[PDB]
Design a protein around this motif. Structure first.
Motif, PDB file in Angstrom:
ATOM      1  N   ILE A 175     -85.150  23.275  -5.920  1.00  0.00           N
ATOM      2  CA  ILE A 175     -83.449  22.186  -6.103  1.00  0.00           C
ATOM      3  C   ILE A 175     -83.850  21.374  -5.033  1.00  0.00           C
ATOM      4  O   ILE A 175     -84.800  21.007  -4.286  1.00  0.00           O
ATOM      5  CB  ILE A 175     -82.434  23.646  -5.480  1.00  0.00           C
ATOM      6  N   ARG A 176     -82.974  20.300  -5.202  1.00  0.00           N
ATOM      7  CA  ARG A 176     -82.666  19.138  -4.057  1.00  0.00           C
ATOM      8  C   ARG A 176     -81.922  19.512  -3.115  1.00  0.00           C
ATOM      9  O   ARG A 176     -80.487  20.326  -3.678  1.00  0.00           O
ATOM     10  CB  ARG A 176     -82.484  17.995  -5.559  1.00  0.00           C
ATOM     11  N   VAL A 177     -81.355  19.264  -1.973  1.00  0.00           N
ATOM     12  CA  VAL A 177     -81.083  19.950  -0.814  1.00  0.00           C
ATOM     13  C   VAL A 177     -80.036  18.430  -0.616  1.00  0.00           C
ATOM     14  O   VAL A 177     -79.158  19.106   0.058  1.00  0.00           O
ATOM     15  CB  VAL A 177     -81.209  20.105   0.404  1.00  0.00           C
ATOM     16  N   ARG A 178     -79.808  17.682  -1.233  1.00  0.00           N
ATOM     17  CA  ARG A 178     -79.104  15.931  -0.969  1.00  0.00           C
ATOM     18  C   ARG A 178     -78.896  15.619  -2.049  1.00  0.00           C
ATOM     19  O   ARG A 178     -79.408  15.719  -3.237  1.00  0.00           O
ATOM     20  CB  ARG A 178     -79.365  15.342   0.081  1.00  0.00           C
ATOM     21  N   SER A 179     -77.937  15.185  -2.113  1.00  0.00           N
ATOM     22  CA  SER A 179     -77.630  13.542  -3.027  1.00  0.00           C
ATOM     23  C   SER A 179     -78.737  12.945  -3.114  1.00  0.00           C
ATOM     24  O   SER A 179     -79.136  12.589  -2.849  1.00  0.00           O
ATOM     25  CB  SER A 179     -76.130  13.237  -2.940  1.00  0.00           C
ATOM     26  N   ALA A 180     -79.158  12.568  -4.479  1.00  0.00           N
ATOM     27  CA  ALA A 180     -79.904  11.628  -4.777  1.00  0.00           C
ATOM     28  C   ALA A 180     -79.732  10.601  -5.874  1.00  0.00           C
ATOM     29  O   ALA A 180     -78.581  11.242  -6.860  1.00  0.00           O
ATOM     30  CB  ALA A 180     -81.257  12.435  -5.591  1.00  0.00           C
ATOM     31  N   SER A 181     -80.248   9.619  -5.946  1.00  0.00           N
ATOM     32  CA  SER A 181     -79.817   8.328  -6.683  1.00  0.00           C
ATOM     33  C   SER A 181     -79.933   8.404  -7.939  1.00  0.00           C
ATOM     34  O   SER A 181     -80.712   9.522  -8.367  1.00  0.00           O
ATOM     35  CB  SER A 181     -80.250   7.483  -6.316  1.00  0.00           C
ATOM     36  N   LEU A 182     -79.497   8.070  -8.892  1.00  0.00           N
ATOM     37  CA  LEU A 182     -79.549   8.283 -10.853  1.00  0.00           C
ATOM     38  C   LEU A 182     -81.418   7.860 -10.504  1.00  0.00           C
ATOM     39  O   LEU A 182     -81.922   8.724 -11.304  1.00  0.00           O
ATOM     40  CB  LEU A 182     -78.856   7.298 -11.230  1.00  0.00           C
ATOM     41  N   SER A 183     -81.732   7.010 -10.220  1.00  0.00           N
ATOM     42  CA  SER A 183     -82.676   6.373  -9.928  1.00  0.00           C
ATOM     43  C   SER A 183     -84.426   7.432  -9.542  1.00  0.00           C
ATOM     44  O   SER A 183     -85.103   7.506 -10.191  1.00  0.00           O
ATOM     45  CB  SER A 183     -83.405   5.128  -9.746  1.00  0.00           C
ATOM     46  N   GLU A 184     -83.907   8.535  -8.407  1.00  0.00           N
ATOM     47  CA  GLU A 184     -84.885   9.565  -7.699  1.00  0.00           C
ATOM     48  C   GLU A 184     -84.397  10.493  -9.341  1.00  0.00           C
ATOM     49  O   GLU A 184     -85.084  11.116  -9.391  1.00  0.00           O
ATOM     50  CB  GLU A 184     -84.019   9.880  -6.671  1.00  0.00           C
ATOM     51  N   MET A 185     -83.688  11.198  -9.959  1.00  0.00           N
ATOM     52  CA  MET A 185     -83.100  12.136 -10.706  1.00  0.00           C
ATOM     53  C   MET A 185     -83.864  11.907 -11.893  1.00  0.00           C
ATOM     54  O   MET A 185     -84.669  12.669 -12.481  1.00  0.00           O
ATOM     55  CB  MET A 185     -81.667  12.530 -10.776  1.00  0.00           C
ATOM     56  N   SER A 186     -83.676  10.607 -12.188  1.00  0.00           N
ATOM     57  CA  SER A 186     -84.681  10.262 -13.584  1.00  0.00           C
ATOM     58  C   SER A 186     -85.658  10.155 -13.577  1.00  0.00           C
ATOM     59  O   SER A 186     -86.529  10.599 -15.091  1.00  0.00           O
ATOM     60  CB  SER A 186     -84.019   8.929 -14.164  1.00  0.00           C
ATOM     61  N   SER A 187     -86.497   9.561 -12.839  1.00  0.00           N
ATOM     62  CA  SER A 187     -87.750   9.222 -12.722  1.00  0.00           C
ATOM     63  C   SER A 187     -88.573  11.281 -12.147  1.00  0.00           C
ATOM     64  O   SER A 187     -89.397  11.080 -12.449  1.00  0.00           O
ATOM     65  CB  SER A 187     -87.985   8.831 -11.258  1.00  0.00           C
ATOM     66  N   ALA A 188     -87.635  11.880 -11.982  1.00  0.00           N
ATOM     67  CA  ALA A 188     -88.350  13.519 -11.158  1.00  0.00           C
ATOM     68  C   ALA A 188     -88.186  14.453 -13.233  1.00  0.00           C
ATOM     69  O   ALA A 188     -88.405  15.301 -12.232  1.00  0.00           O
ATOM     70  CB  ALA A 188     -87.655  14.192  -9.950  1.00  0.00           C
TER      71      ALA A 188
END
Ligand SMILES: *Cc1c(COP(=O)(O)O)cnc(C)c1O
Ligand SMILES: *Cc1c(COP(=O)(O)O)cnc(C)c1O
Lengths: 386, 386
Positions: free
Chosen positions: B95-108
């Protein structure tokens, strides 16, 4: 210090998926070096000080500039830094700017570092390393005329003078430099201590039968090299000014910016708490920007309720304390804000600028405390423009 | 955050030539996990929170323990951390424990992270990613019942409730969890906010036709999981306590020690200044130990003239301000001191111990501000003994 300095120079896609990052102005670095050079006497040479991974700005990304500028000497602190410098192809003089343990010095022999010694035992240890490697090692003797009481040999007593002569006459070592370092940016004090250094180094060279014309005398950090020109001597050791951190000399702008982006935008009604310890409560219906940067990236806890960041060319207040990974900013009155927009934590954006003094006051740290840890904790992108 | 978490687990030789380093007690980590487990209800599962490179202690060196202990869930913040977790072979919930930018989420996407959303736009963005990748993405909805005002959707207004329902009914997403997070270690406040969370999550599940028995309700950090057991619910999110940093619960000792060694020993007569700004002057003939650690390694400037370090089982005062790379310690009265001897900056040595409170008071920081940056700035050695 890092055991290994990563070999990658982050590209745009990599930065795009990073939470936060440093932007290093290569043009400003080049400009700062050229400006600095313009003030150096014809008979002094430059040793660019690149400790703490080039003051957080990154040895690997900056070395090609150092080489293109024909700088003859680089200074480092850790072995990882020495490796990164040699891996750039730099074949000039490489000096260590601090006392290093025997274990550090022995592991770095292949890197051809000129170590910095201020005690008999260091001289003895290096002489043994020289013996075992079948070579003569080049060293700088650190003296305490500056009064740092750190790396140097103090010569104000008979015992200190005797120890200095022992260091300077050690078999299997070649004394290539004699140096000191100054603790303050007070020009009158630096001038008095410079006179004492000239006396001490002259005496030491006489006692150990060293030839002046083969020894590099060096005492000047950034401040001293520019503001006490007669202390330039044979070599200067500028660190901070090259990177635009010499507080006395604002004509060398900082090369570093610290950035993140808006992750998400949250509507929070009046009378709502924000952050650990609920140190802030909204006084109105608000829109808050969630930034994925926190103190583990080097944006301190103390920034909360004190600092402003720049978003879409406007200042926005950090509200609540910064957490390990997240910072919250009030964008209620900021027009045009959208997720993904770039946020400047330190640096310039449109007509706005965050000053070093502002950073220091808010963080309750000095600027290099901030940027050195920014550098170990975030990727660097080298901007080449203008 | 670091773009890449180094794949190396430093060995003894590598540590021996490092200036400073962290020692991580793997036994203490294992013990802390087992002790924590002993207090969890049979119906709750554990999500080990490993953000900031496992709280400075290092994801890569600690993941084999997480796997051996059969922990079903790990939480991270950055993409580099997600990568390091999957590269360990961990195939549980991430799980991610924080808000993440779209650019972060899309790369992962390849890492199968369950993202944490608290806004309509995040839901929309992830739904589009799901559409484009031909899959249904698993998400946790963050609610603001805890009052963090950071990552969650506040539901205290009609507009907030409407936004929450929009998030929860987004096509192409599977809501696998609903959560909140508490800002204080006050048990009565946590209990009141827990009741509100149960009301809000029940309402949301009703509105979006979610099935309770398929949703993981989770609200508890380290403090809450142990001290408000009724808040354990379906899953707990312990970070600090696993690493021995839960200040309310000293029965989980810290797993981290910060060390350096004596580089050189310097004789300095009475009335001699030490360090930048000459903030200390010897009052007697002294022997000073030069340590190759400074604020760029995460040992703050403020430690000078305040802190003590441990050398040969004895406390020694840090004198003068700490520099970027060097710390000076008064060993005049310390018997047996020699170059190369290990120095404890934080931790235990023989019968002496440096307390967390001592560190905090001297640095004027909270403990995790220190250790997270220690972790980005120094190698970790994993001690396996006892
Ligand atoms: C860091 C350092 C320098 C450079 O200092 P600045 O003030 O950054 O220019 C020069 N000499 C020594 C010995 C140093 O440790
Ligand atoms: C870090 C964090 C945790 C763990 O907090 P600790 O106090 O270290 O146990 C749990 N949940 C979230 C959302 C976090 O950000």
């Amino acid at each position: 210090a890092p055991l290994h300095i990563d070999t990658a120079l982050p590209d745009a896609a990599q930065i795009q998926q990073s939470n936060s990052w440093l932007e290093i102005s290569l043009g400003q670095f080049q400009s700062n070096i050229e400006q600095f050079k313009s003030h150096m006497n014809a008979n002094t040479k430059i040793c660019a000080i690149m400790k703490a991974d080039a003051y957080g700005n990154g040895i690997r990304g900056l070395m090609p500039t150092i080489i293109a500028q024909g700088i003859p000497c680089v200074g480092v602190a850790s072995n990882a830094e020495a490796r990164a410098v040699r891996e750039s192809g730099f074949k000039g003089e490489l000096i260590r700017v601090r006392s290093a343990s025997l274990s550090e010095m022995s592991s770095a022999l292949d890197l051809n570092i000129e170590e910095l010694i201020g005690t008999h035992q260091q001289a003895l240890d290096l002489a043994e390393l020289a013996k075992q490697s079948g070579k003569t090692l080049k060293v700088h003797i650190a003296l305490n005329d500056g009064g740092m009481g750190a790396a140097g040999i103090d010569m104000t007593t008979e015992a200190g003078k005797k120890e200095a002569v022992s260091i300077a006459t050690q078999p299997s070592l070649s004394v290539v430099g004699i140096m000191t370092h100054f603790p303050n940016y007070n020009a009158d004090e630096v001038r008095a201590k410079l006179a004492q250094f000239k006396e001490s180094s002259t005496w030491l060279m006489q006692q150990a039968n060293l030839k002046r014309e083969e020894i590099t005398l060096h005492v000047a950090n950034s401040y001293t090299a520019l503001n006490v020109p007669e202390a330039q001597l044979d070599m200067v050791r500028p660190g901070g000014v090259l990177f635009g951190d010499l507080p006395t000399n604002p004509e060398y702008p900082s090369i570093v910016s610290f950035k993140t982006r808006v992750s998400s935008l949250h509507h929070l009604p009046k009378d709502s708490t924000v952050g650990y310890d609920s140190t802030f409560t909204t006084s109105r219906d608000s829109v808050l920007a969630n930034l994925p940067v926190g103190y583990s990236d080097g944006y301190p806890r103390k920034m909360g309720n004190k600092a402003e960041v720049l978003i879409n060319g406007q200042r926005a207040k950090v509200v609540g304390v910064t957490s390990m990974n997240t910072t919250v900013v009030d964008v209620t009155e900021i027009k045009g804000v959208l997720p993904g927009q770039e946020v400047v934590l330190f640096g310039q954006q449109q007509k706005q600028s965050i000053a070093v003094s502002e950073m220091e006051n808010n963080a309750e740290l000095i600027f290099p405390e901030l940027y050195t840890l920014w550098g170990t904790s975030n990727p660097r992108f080298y901007v080449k423009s203008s």
